[PDB]
Amino acid sequence: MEINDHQLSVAELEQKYQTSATKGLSASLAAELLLRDGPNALRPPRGTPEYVKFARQLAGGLQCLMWVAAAICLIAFAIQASEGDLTTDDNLYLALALIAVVVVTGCFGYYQEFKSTNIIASFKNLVPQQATVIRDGDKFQINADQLVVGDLVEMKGGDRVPADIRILQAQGRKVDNSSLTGESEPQTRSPECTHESPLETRNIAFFSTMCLEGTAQGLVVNTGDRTIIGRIASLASGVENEKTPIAIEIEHFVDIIAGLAILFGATFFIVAMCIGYTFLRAMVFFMAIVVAYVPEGLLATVTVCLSLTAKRLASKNCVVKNLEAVETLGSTSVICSDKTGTLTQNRMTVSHLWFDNHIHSADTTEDQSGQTFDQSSETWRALCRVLTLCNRAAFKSGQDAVPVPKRIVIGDASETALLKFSELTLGNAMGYRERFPKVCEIPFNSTNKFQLSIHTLEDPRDPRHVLVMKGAPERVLERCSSILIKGQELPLDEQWREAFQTAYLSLGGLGERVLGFCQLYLSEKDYPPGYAFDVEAMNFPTSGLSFAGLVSMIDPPRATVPDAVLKCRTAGIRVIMVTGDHPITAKAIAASVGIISEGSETVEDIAARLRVPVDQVNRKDARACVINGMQLKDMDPSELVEALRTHPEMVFARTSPQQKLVIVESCQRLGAIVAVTGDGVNDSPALKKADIGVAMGIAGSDAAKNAADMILLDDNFASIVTGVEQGRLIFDNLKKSIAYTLTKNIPELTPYLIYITVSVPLPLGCITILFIELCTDIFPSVSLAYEKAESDIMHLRPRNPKRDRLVNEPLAAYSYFQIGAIQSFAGFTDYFTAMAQEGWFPLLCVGLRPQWENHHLQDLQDSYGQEWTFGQRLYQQYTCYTVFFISIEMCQIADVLIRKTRRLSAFQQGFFRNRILVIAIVFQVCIGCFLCYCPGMPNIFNFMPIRFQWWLVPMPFGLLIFVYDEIRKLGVRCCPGSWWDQELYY
Amino acid sequence: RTLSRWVWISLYYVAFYVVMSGIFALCIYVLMRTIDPYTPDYQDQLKSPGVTLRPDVQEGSINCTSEKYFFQESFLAPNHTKFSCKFGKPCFIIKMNRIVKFLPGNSDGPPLYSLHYFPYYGKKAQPHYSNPKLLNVPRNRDVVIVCKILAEHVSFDNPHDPYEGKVEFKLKIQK
């Protein structure tokens, strides 16, 4: 936190600054200093990321996996350069394919982020502005950047504070520190030192804060970057992002894949050497096996998957600056939210009214979703006209269509709230204020601040003049005698008088501001209809007036907030309110939004009820706590951790931005994922430090918006809820997709394995494998992303990064060990059927490859004794590849269906409801059928038309896969703690 | 990675991969059943016989003469093994790739089968069956020669199997 020189005698202040309070500085010096340090302006965003940033998208962690994969393939190709190799179509193709995926995916992702930035640029509207300085005794308006340190400056109503100043003099000046400090209502500024902390003191004005009203002079304490907001702005750029949870999960994933890759590559390398293959061959096998383990398509399928989800978020008006940022929300354990602007509307409005010695709450909501009071009473009518009539507040031309609350009004704070209220409940104030013509009024006086005005009568019954006046309850209490009730007057009795007093203290204690409203009919006999009374003499009996009632006011939370917080809590997310506002209001709002449930007592509540010193009560008995920022400065790390751990519902009030940062950090110390939602600049350091920052599109400031990882254009808090939900379903579906693709590797890799072991003609080729991995499975693989919630995900607790893994041992245990195996056997069965039918019985196929592969041997005896040339048998091998391809597809049908659900049976969820999956298998089968049957296929791809009978051979295997996993899906549902769930269930 | 539970993994696959190998073999064995021991289900691949040669690029039996095809009957076991007929400037020998029940039909570049053997009955039916010179002037040069066979039954695939019914070798006798 910062420090300052604010508390100093003006003589001492100027003594230090070497400046004249009335005259300011001399032009010469002003120019000298301006040239010395630097103009009054923050150094432009030290970040001018060139288009070279595109490269960023290319590296990442995942793209690196494909990069190394591509490199490995290239090297393998380089190794096979040792001899004449077929790789011209194999390895180089793959390596290039890998590079193609990283670059294409990179381009796509980059464009997305770029589009968002462009949209952001559209919003920037800049105005240089100017400042009013006083030098050599003369007032001159110069460019704000020209402002130096230690020179007198004058601020008026509406002008922005050019730089941090130390107010020397002021007159009814009220600056708006809403964004910087977070203070809701306009804080008045004065020459005298009020508080120790320079942020709360009145003797200092701040940069970027507009002065609502009044005027004031001040010596510039800080200029440019050294200013407060500049300090915050600078800090909001030195924080680190930290690795996204989804990113680490994929890191673990690659570790597993690579692990399996190396194990088999190495094990088989040794095995190959044992057999006889030269080292060269052993090495090519090593490279081959490893490279084969790398899923090229999975990078595309994952990227697209995230993109699809992101697109949905965009539709919801929830934009993600980063692609990985989509999953995060499904991992948030704590939400540090700001009060004003975020949880609330940040707009003041009439709260409660006092009529017939009763308190009636008005509708504070922006949307007017609350309940209206009983307007029937006459007392209400009278008070309404007094509030409506006595005001300078009036709607500006143009606010007809707009809602009465959101519409702008020209007037004071209270008068605006009062005007809006009148217009809403009692009807239009236009005709009403026009009804009674105002002859002479007395604006709020410098002292006693009473404001009165007298009008004529509109009513036909009595022609008496009507007098109205509003002011502080105590001052007005001094001037009032009679009290009105239900339309009839009465004198004041101590019982009711005190009732009024207690009511005043009650509402005043509620945190609201109360205003006394009174009126008095004039003795027309004494004051004739023609009598013209001026402001000079006491024409109206200021005393003996009839006091009507009081009207208080406050600002409410947004309409969506309460329900959003309840959902976040039901989700198991801890909601902590971190605000710089006053504790009295902070707690009230907290209880309103639900951060502090009812019945939950703070340490003070207990001390209050028991009427015992606050220090006595044991903190353990208090579940909720409102920690004052004053203590926060003193607290240590162990202190914060204790507070955070010991109290379920917490609210940090009067906390500086730096403190909000320490709170977020303290929550991170626990090792939990924190999400911060804010509005103003005070949230800039917090929002950037949080695992995920959340700014408000409109209600949010620029600094905080730049710091935020996510922005809400609609400023709907409910979106947060949707956000947390949107993050957990995609995780399960990713598992589905991954599992599916991973299952294909067994039937793809095995053919080449056995080829080396048994020495049988190659069952599946390279082109074939590519058609499965890149051609067919692509649609089904994406279709699974469309899978819906298997059960109520919102009910389950947030996953544990340590325990739960996207891809874990169990998944591999079934994609590779169980299902994958079944598919492999299906493929080989198809292989043997074709071969056996052609004339090559399975038993004879062993050790045939050496002769088979040889292009020279034209005479190759089959089981019948027939002699096959090279092309002939090779044709059979190719017509043998197609069927294996098709077989994979057929097995993939069953795999896709079972992959659809993790726990539930096909019955329940019904994988068929998903239309995209349906079109997935129809297109998949159609394509496979095409590749085999298309006329030029055997020439280009070496894929030949398949005899119809062939299609059936892989059928029974597919059924086995389905029937097998289905029972597994049933046993798991029956036996939660079953042995199957532990092993199977991934 | 577990402990005192691996037995639940090992034993599992032992009787899982077992069930799978048992089913895999189960399917191969049924397939094998639906095939003749004497003739393949498809001859189409070998449709047009190819011609191969020697140059790496009889007790019992029956006496015969150049004549028409000889039918040993049907391709069955009821009859014992069907009897088979008897039979510088490099010499290369050519033969016709044997194909069951196939009857061949028959009833200047640089300087340089009897039907009584068909149809071939196959190895199982006929084990010891027996299927039926470039004195050129030039030398010290690579000569491309293409020896092919003719017939309605014989077809050539110039674009593909250069062996289909024909040869293509480059002899060079450098002296």
CSV table of C-alpha atoms in Angstrom, one decimal, chain A residues 814 816-818 821-822 825 828-829 832-833 836-839 841-843 855-856 858-859 861 864-872 876 947 949-950 957 960 964 979-980 982-984, chain B residues 5 8-9 12-13 16-17 20-21 24 27-28 31-32 34-42 44-48 50-52 57 95 97-98 100 120 122-123 160-161 163-164 169:
chain,number,residue,atom,x,y,z
A,814,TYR,CA,-9.5,-50.3,-21.7
A,816,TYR,CA,-5.6,-50.3,-25.4
A,817,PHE,CA,-6.2,-53.5,-23.3
A,818,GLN,CA,-9.8,-54.5,-23.7
A,821,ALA,CA,-7.8,-55.8,-28.6
A,822,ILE,CA,-11.3,-57.0,-29.7
A,825,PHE,CA,-8.8,-59.6,-33.6
A,828,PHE,CA,-7.2,-60.1,-38.5
A,829,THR,CA,-10.2,-62.4,-38.8
A,832,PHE,CA,-7.7,-64.4,-42.8
A,833,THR,CA,-11.1,-64.8,-44.4
A,836,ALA,CA,-8.0,-68.2,-46.9
A,837,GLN,CA,-10.7,-67.6,-49.5
A,838,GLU,CA,-8.1,-66.4,-52.1
A,839,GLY,CA,-6.1,-69.6,-51.7
A,841,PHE,CA,-4.7,-70.6,-45.7
A,842,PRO,CA,-3.7,-68.9,-42.4
A,843,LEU,CA,-1.2,-71.5,-41.4
A,855,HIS,CA,9.1,-58.2,-56.2
A,856,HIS,CA,11.3,-60.7,-58.1
A,858,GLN,CA,6.9,-64.6,-59.7
A,859,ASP,CA,6.3,-68.1,-58.5
A,861,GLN,CA,2.8,-71.3,-54.1
A,864,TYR,CA,-3.5,-75.1,-53.6
A,865,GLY,CA,-0.1,-75.1,-55.3
A,866,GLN,CA,-1.0,-72.2,-57.5
A,867,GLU,CA,1.7,-69.7,-58.5
A,868,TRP,CA,1.2,-66.0,-57.8
A,869,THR,CA,3.2,-63.3,-59.5
A,870,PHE,CA,4.0,-60.1,-57.5
A,871,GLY,CA,1.2,-57.8,-58.6
A,872,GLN,CA,-1.4,-60.6,-58.3
A,876,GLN,CA,-4.7,-59.4,-52.7
A,947,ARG,CA,-16.6,-58.5,-52.0
A,949,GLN,CA,-19.4,-61.1,-47.9
A,950,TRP,CA,-16.3,-59.4,-46.5
A,957,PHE,CA,-16.7,-58.6,-33.1
A,960,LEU,CA,-19.0,-58.4,-28.7
A,964,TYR,CA,-19.3,-56.4,-23.4
A,979,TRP,CA,-14.0,-53.8,-8.7
A,980,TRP,CA,-15.0,-53.0,-12.3
A,982,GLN,CA,-12.0,-49.1,-10.0
A,983,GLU,CA,-10.4,-50.7,-13.0
A,984,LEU,CA,-12.8,-49.9,-15.9
B,5,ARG,CA,-4.3,-56.1,-6.3
B,8,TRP,CA,-6.8,-59.1,-9.8
B,9,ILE,CA,-5.2,-57.7,-13.0
B,12,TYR,CA,-8.2,-61.0,-15.3
B,13,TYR,CA,-6.4,-60.8,-18.6
B,16,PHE,CA,-10.0,-62.4,-20.8
B,17,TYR,CA,-7.3,-62.3,-23.5
B,20,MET,CA,-10.6,-63.3,-26.9
B,21,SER,CA,-8.0,-65.6,-28.4
B,24,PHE,CA,-10.6,-65.2,-32.5
B,27,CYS,CA,-13.9,-67.5,-36.0
B,28,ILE,CA,-10.9,-68.6,-38.0
B,31,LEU,CA,-14.2,-69.9,-41.7
B,32,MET,CA,-11.7,-72.6,-42.6
B,34,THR,CA,-16.4,-73.4,-45.4
B,35,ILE,CA,-13.6,-73.9,-47.9
B,36,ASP,CA,-12.7,-76.8,-50.3
B,37,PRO,CA,-9.5,-78.6,-49.6
B,38,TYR,CA,-8.9,-79.0,-53.4
B,39,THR,CA,-9.9,-75.6,-54.8
B,40,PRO,CA,-9.9,-71.9,-53.6
B,41,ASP,CA,-13.2,-69.9,-53.3
B,42,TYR,CA,-11.8,-67.3,-55.7
B,44,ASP,CA,-10.2,-64.3,-60.0
B,45,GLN,CA,-7.0,-62.9,-58.6
B,46,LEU,CA,-5.0,-65.4,-60.7
B,47,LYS,CA,-7.6,-65.0,-63.5
B,48,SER,CA,-4.9,-64.5,-66.2
B,50,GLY,CA,1.4,-65.0,-65.5
B,51,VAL,CA,4.7,-66.3,-67.0
B,52,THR,CA,7.7,-66.8,-64.8
B,57,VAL,CA,15.7,-62.1,-61.9
B,95,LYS,CA,6.7,-72.0,-67.5
B,97,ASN,CA,1.9,-70.4,-63.5
B,98,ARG,CA,-0.2,-73.4,-62.6
B,100,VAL,CA,-6.5,-75.2,-61.1
B,120,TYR,CA,-4.0,-78.7,-63.5
B,122,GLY,CA,-3.9,-78.9,-57.7
B,123,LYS,CA,-1.3,-80.0,-55.2
B,160,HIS,CA,0.5,-53.4,-63.8
B,161,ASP,CA,2.0,-56.9,-63.4
B,163,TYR,CA,4.8,-60.6,-65.4
B,164,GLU,CA,1.1,-61.3,-66.4
B,169,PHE,CA,14.7,-59.2,-68.8
